[model samples]
Target chain A: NLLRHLKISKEQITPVVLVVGDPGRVDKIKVVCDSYVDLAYNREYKSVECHYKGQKFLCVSHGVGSAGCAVCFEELCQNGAKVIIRAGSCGSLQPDLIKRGDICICNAAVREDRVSHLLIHGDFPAVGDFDVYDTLNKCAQELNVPVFNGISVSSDMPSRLEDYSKANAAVVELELATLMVIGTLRKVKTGGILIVDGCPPHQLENMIKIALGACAKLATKYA
Target chain B: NLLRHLKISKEQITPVVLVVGDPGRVDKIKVVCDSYVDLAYNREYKSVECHYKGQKFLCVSHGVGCAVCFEELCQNGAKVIIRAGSCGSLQPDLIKRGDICICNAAVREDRVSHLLIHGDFPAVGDFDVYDTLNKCAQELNVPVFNGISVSSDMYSRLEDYSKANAAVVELELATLMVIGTLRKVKTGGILIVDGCPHQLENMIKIALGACAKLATKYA
Candidate 1:
């Protein structure tokens, strides 16, 4: 069965997926992947069947807000994704602790977005899969990457220099919460990691490896 | 400051709280604690501070329904809150007496959450806490039923939940999930089979392990 929006069949898409914002990053990620194949790019959603180390996965791009990104998350699950980990960049809420190159793992989200409110109802806590978060932290430490974990604000749109700190959010991002709530509400395992949006210090590769390493562990843990 | 109905000061509360239904279970839980201190007992509310496995936490009981126990806990900065109690099996074909049911979300049929937030807003379990509870139960080699629980206390109304595919029927779950998210506190629940809790011992064991694991990682 092919997902209408993503334009890929369940047979072509891997159950474990890594979603990003930029359709361009799908190949950027696929380049480091052990094996890569271009599948389809419809609208802003770009997809591929790829392998990393010991496991195979679908690397798909879910554009912008919960409005659009939510569809990708929904279809991915409707097709077959049991676990979806979002890799992207975000604005940090902590002043001194999180730096340009550091990593932020969203454990929970403040549902300030309009999409999630419509998806379910009554302040549903948009939380990342705890297993995903736990493994992400493990791999981050294993890779010697500086990692921070906390809740994040899933905003409707980003137009300002955004305390989100008062709610104990460590970072602000547009896509993470949308992926999380959609994944959980659909019973798919989901999580996310961010590069504190940087310069030479902005180790995007480290974020990618951290995500893949967690996937590697999760690949076995779920098996 | 003290909660008017609970009559417990914010000063005496812990960020991680375990709330059960009956006030009598408060001491039963406290006595098993490595160390426990009486905090308050007023009307239907009973409160205490206790330690298990090197962590201090508040063990509280709010009457039958969540009229005030959960609200006061949230207002006082309770970060990780759990409703570790009992419920009747709505899915008897799958769930049995003394079996476990873990709440992922509640079917909001109560009189409280709708008053606070629109019906579209869902009362969801904190993923971290929900997963932690599920993990702990697995470690104990026990099974759990994970599904939507209904929150109507009307003993007169039971068949509706079964038709709705609710795994269990609960009283305070609507308020617990509603207030927990509105307040942004980590929340989840594990309930014993109805026919005073034949598995309360197992429920308490899993709830404490969940509390300890969360404290280790996030606290």
Candidate 2:
């Protein structure tokens, strides 16, 4: 049965992981890798495994919301994913710095979404694991992409321009808080790098390409 | 445009509603209707509308979890949904109680399933609606089918049967509060029925049938 398919044992899994909000983005990560496999493909969840710089790594797509993403994170944790990185994008939550192409490494998310509440009571912190943050920070410095570590608001659903505008949060995007809280609850180290797409309540098509460069930079890990 | 094809106006669907957690039950709601149209059938969301007993109402599936359901419910309120009845089966928090559960309403479900959270925040609610549920209870002359149902922890993706028993939350489903809060935000009323399927886990067919009977009686 597909449900009963044998998974890579916990002992076989690497501690580091990278998560993207879209399954299509997994291909983006693979472009830079030497080799990889499509481990599983079901629903909006897709898992890919490969070696980056000779170190084994896993990349998976987490669909849209925190709830769906949480399921993937939980199962991965069950199968021995101990560290996670979310290479994704978000809208600029701050008005002064709503520039596309900038990067933000979220430190904490105000989990206004229910996924975190489901895992732990809403009172528990959804902060990125300190170690993951430190490692990501070092990598970001090497990559030379601008980054910010601050409180971001995790919404109940995918954010709209107005959703972020009304929120007036530091940063707004999909799934960072979902990734962080789930990674935290399951005792997996997790962090995220978001490429700003557009200013909240504003849209700019040309700004999207900026994310590619940022994502590529984040995907590169120091050997 | 997809919205035009469906005759839907964006951001104007005020009365949005959905019934999920159990998939096929909404179809049964269709059986008892006088006249209706099936608008959409995709994912777990099933939409149908018709007049039952001269009262106009619509039925739709919201799938699992309050986050999506709440979004749909708010959209309904924003468009035209004034009343909603979420039909779901309840998990038994205690050993006793055979199929005669009436939920006062849903409690704030912390599925922690969504990533957007300040954490430590409690999603609790729904006081006034209890009186309305009680009123419905008095009107319906069924004894076993009356009283408060606790919609709580059991509704999570990872079902925790042990916690359900400990909470004395006879009904192991939670969402009424979250849904209520969303509806209230947009201005609307919502109600939930336990569907009296306490033995649901052990008997899937019987439980679904029980849901149909309850739907027939209530609607």
Candidate 3:
């Protein structure tokens, strides 16, 4: 247990954890659980534990960017989080295929962020766990929500779309590269599902539905 | 003015800064400085202030990664920053051992920059800073090459080690570039080749000399 940072014990946190960039999103998961309890809140890390369909899990807010996100991920791993998934918003890089309010199931990320680079070598690809990726896709299919599964470029700046689109990335987000790479290095099963929130605000509710639906399925299978 | 992180007043910090990754390397710059004072150190940020050729400057250790380093620099109002460090080269033909390379741009390989800027945004060096470094290297008769280095957070993730090696791998350059660009500051760096053990001292000398020269010129 990293006392100073997360301030939570292994017993308090479940193996299956879902991370988000916004603190408010944690509440969306709270209502779906049978019971929920706040664990801690410090800076950008807001933590909670909940039971979904008799399966236990943790929900944490990692703020934005891989730099700050890396700290949250490291501390969670320290507290015995075995499987982690990032549920957050992203800009549509492949606007042709992915639009606002659609969900993107990330298989791999272009390592454009800084924190993950310090943890591993440049040659090591920032990729998702196959089982976790498959699980997300499976849940999306079960929920009847269409998802585009492919590469998403993770970036620090929120300025350009031309290069990422040229590289054939379907979506863009802030923290997935840090999450996936750190998860791999720490030997945890990691995956990400991003809600396309680019322009004119698509059905954010629909994207959230898919995320929660997938979380419920994962908790049951992993528990 | 940020009290929590850097713990230093804006008045104490200089507009010009010299940043490095190693704590021990900070001592090398101390000798070149006429008088020096330790500012504050919390975690990887070890702060110092010194004078070179009667010009005041701040020397800070941003540790091994760019994430934390960005906060310390931006909050301190560091208008012009020059990173002096050692790097592993992939293109030995273009850059040799004991040589110094001025970074002109960085390929978006690290994820940290995405948070500061946006994905697909080109990360580049401040041209004026690069020009100053180039002039200093030439005046000192140092072997200097201009490079577009790849910035990676993962020092161990090496699938394309061949290509990264050819391009020259430096850990913190991209972070500095992005931070400088976003903050509207002039930023540049001089890198020493790291793989050749025999040329270590010469490389260090070349890098330190370039840093001192830049500080003198700018300050």
Candidate 4:
């Protein structure tokens, strides 16, 4: 029964899915979803479907870390998740481009995290799917939320970006590297939007409301 | 007897010693000693003081890796160890270097297990000893091995250097990185090496033999 659950064939499924880190956030998206119902709920993954822009899409919650996100991404691919968009919060490296309550649309991710090598060669680049980001920016503008587009950095520990020199680059985050690496291996298109919680050296709490708001609204555009 | 043991300090003792990696191998060094007596015996560490080359010296055995090698090195230092010789094997990038390598000089050895108090960032690379290795190499007329040695995933789990792309530069065994990183913080010296049997897949056994043989013939 578990193996059956683990191997969901891709032939019978839709191609677009939105992955978030929290289940209650899934409920928030469902409230705004148009004519949707639950598809499955198991092990850090809860899936639901709805229509948007004349496209049927999915919304699932994947928990924290590249490890947790990897599990959800793997399972969803087996079940036919062709494209994935992650919405989460992160610390900002380029504070000049990011502020508390602002959304960061990630373009690329540096895999300082250890998990990506498991799915691909350690040196393989993990760039986000820009088409989804194009759609995401349009949605953010519609929602009237401020969004900054840039790079996310994946690291095992949170302090990797803290005071570390990047030689002038975009802000960094936790899950994007793993998301892109696993997505590429599984041949699924994946990208993410991380909201900065103020300057990472200062306020982490103020960025939460805007991040949650961005995640809730992005689901409508993607899912 | 214990008080007399405590009274033995560096200034009042012989300034030379010999170190080995195995208990049995220490006997191999003792064959060259003029007069010898058992000094101490500890787990993986057995000591004997003897006369060699008209100088009083100590012979001791250390087990394996940076951690094991470091304890014996510290013991020798505490017992007035100085001007010791090291003999080992080679796996040079250059094909000319032979399998039977003898070096009075090492690039340096890493001390990973000793850095528990210092955290990862402040643990390796003491630069002043560069002259020591160079001078010894010139004096011994022996070939020296020098380079960065990365640790492998065989006996320990490293943070995913396992990718095929990064494995190209990984030449160290056990982990020279842990020692390199930690030793840089202390004034301790470190030497990374590729052993005689450059098995890329099974380099552990050959590297151990090199570390063992060198510590045996020299200290």
Candidate 5:
């Protein structure tokens, strides 16, 4: 069963998937793996199988925006991914509290995106799996990263910057809310680790390390 | 100032607007208006200002989705917008072919709404607007059901029938509710039954007549 957009067969993907937005970021994360293999790249979704501390998980790029990411999340669910973690970037709505280069662990997200609205009720909270959220929180603390855990508001219209920034939220991104709601409805555990950046190569690697640590724990549980 | 999509100045648009989905539907609605004038037609939005019972209101078609419609209604400064459209019946018990539904609230599934407001925010219709539609329906002696409509983005996917049917399914209602709340405008509507597809002329007539009555009462 090929996961259409990623063009990877179900057999090739692992139960635990770490999703990110940019394809190039996938290579930066390869250092955590003992050995890894490239699965495929179709459109914006690039798939790779990697082993971290003897635990194997799939790392895939989900592009930008909730609509495109919704396809990736659904396909991964179809391919038997039981746990998914997103390591992405966002603008800090609380710029004073969360500066650029700081990490934000999204335990819950304010659904400001279209894709999640289609999948579930508006009042249904876009929340992270308890187990996954705990793992990431534990990992971030161990890494000594400056991290804040709270709600990240996701939105579709990036052009409406003024209104978006005005919201009282921890982090603001485009993908986490969609992942969380779909993950819950489909029985997939979901969580996210975001870095605040307009320009990156900032603290993304540290955030990825925190994500990998969480994934290592999840592999034993799911994979 | 000019509204970008409609290409009409704010001065040209009246505070009370009647929104519909189809351009042809707008032409059919011209009967209720004593005298009507075409303001402009841009893309899927066909604009007109019409007088019903000596009260003037802008009547415009908001196309198929909420994003474009949100801009039109917000920019126009519409104090009230009553939508007239047809919806397929989800619950056989509550809805029959050609029955009218006065929407109370929206159990939203539309993605366009998330872009406008937080997803957790309930898209409830303005209470005053709902009352006006209820009054109009009563005046028409139409067997109308007051209900909550479920708005979805995907037309083909029906995997979640239990939940969708639990909340009455309609296309444009949730978007209108979200827009109304965000813009702080009074908005409500009447839905004509079209799922079984009998003679739609009667249902359409009742929906339009109710809208005209609403405009008259607004005056």
Candidate 6:
């Protein structure tokens, strides 16, 4: 079956999947795959198939906001991607602690996004699959990367740092809640890694590395 | 500050928390704790504080429906709240007696939530809590079922709920989720099959394992 938005057929995808907010990150991430195939590009979503070490995976970009990002997530899961992960840019909810160079490993996000509430109830949590999340956090730690693990705010208006601190959220961003919630409903592994502040060159590079690295590692482990 | 109805103070609570239906079950569940402390008991509500695998959390039993248990817990500094109780399977074909149901969201057939929020608003469970419990169950060799739940104000009306294409039918979650959202509390629930659903011990075991990791992450 061909996914309506991603324009990729079910047979073209792999068990391990990667998602991002920018279509071009698929190109940047291609460098890590060792072997890469550009499948197609339609709308803001781009699809690529890759092989790392002895494992296979697909990378697709779902441009900004849950409204559009949800379609890509749903499609990836529908196409037999057992483990789906996203790496994107984020803003700090804690200024002093979550500075530049740090990555936020979101185990859960307070679902304040407009689309997610419409997807389920307003109170339904936007949660990452623990195995996928812990694996991402594990890779970050093994590499000596600075990481913060906690709930994040995924809001449409999107911050009250003190209030967020009291609530245990470390960062704020768009699209994550949608992906996490969709993953929960769809019964697939979903998780996200975010670069704090905006994405600097090194920050974006490492963020991509951590995400890609986890995909490769999990591909072997889950298998 | 004192929590209005629980007859407890905010300081008496922990950020990691649990909710259930029977008062005596709090005592039963206490065995899972490394150390346990009794906090309050008023009417059908019973609260206990425990240290699990070195993480501190409170377990409170909200017997029967959700008039105030969730409200007071959120008001009293509960950052993570979950209801571990019993539920009747809505789809007996797929869900059976003794099967566990992890609720994702609930139909707001309860009066309390309808009065508090607009009609469009629905009650939802925390995704992390829902997933964590399921993972714990899997590790425990108890593969569970999960999906949308139907929460009604009263019993009777079983046929209608099944017609709506829901999973479990209970009397509380709409209130649990509405109050959680109204208060910004991270709230969710898991239930074992009562007539209505063993793994009863396995259910509590799963809840204990799940809560320990959750409290470790934050509390």
Instruction: Give the interface-residue alpha carbon RMSD of model 1.
Output: 6.2
Give the C-alpha lDDT of model 5.
Answer: 0.72
Worst 10 residues of 2 chain A by lDDT: A201-210
Best by DockQ: 1
Q: Score residue A90 of candidate 1 by CA lDDT.
A: 76
- By summed lDDT, the worst window of 10 consecutive residues in model 4 chain B runs over B100-109
What is chain B's TM-score across the candidates, in the order shown? 0.91, 0.53, 0.83, 0.46, 0.85, 0.93
Tens-place lDDT digits, model 1, residues B91-139: 7877888888888777677778777764434466777788889999999
Scored against the true structure, residue B192 in model 2 reaches a CA lDDT of: 41
The positional error of residue B205 in candidate 2, measured at the CA in angstroms, is: 68
CAPRI class of candidate 4: incorrect
Candidate 2 lDDT by residue in tens digits, A1-223: 1332223445434566677777777776666666777677766767777664455666777675553676667767677676777776676767675576666666556567766666555433455654455555665565554466554666664434344344334577656667765765465666666767666312211112223232333335422
Ranking by lDDT: 6, 1, 5, 3, 2, 4
TM-score of each: 0.75, 0.44, 0.50, 0.43, 0.51, 0.71
| lDDT, candidate 1, A63-180, per-residue tens | 6544378778878878778899988877777667777667788766666676776765433446666668889998999988888876666666532223245434567777666776
Candidate 4 lDDT tens digits, B62-164: 5544344433344434322222222222222442323222211111122343233211111112222233444444454444443222232232122332221
The candidate that wins on TM-score is 1
TM-score of chain B of 3: 0.83
- lDDT (tens digit, per residue) of candidate 6 on A105-221: 876676667777776655444656666877887788777777777667776751244555544467778878788767766677788898876421576777777787789888996
TM-score of chain A of each: 0.90, 0.77, 0.89, 0.77, 0.91, 0.91
In candidate 5, stretches whose alpha carbon ends up further than 4 angstroms from where it belongs are: A65-67, A158-167, A198-202, B1-219
* Residue-by-residue lDDT tens digits, candidate 6, B47-126: 88877777888888766635677877887788888888888887878888999887767777777876775433446666
Indicate which candidate wins on lDDT. 6
Candidate 3 interface RMSD, angstroms, 1 decimal: 11.1
The DockQ for candidate 3, computed on C-alphas, is: 0.02
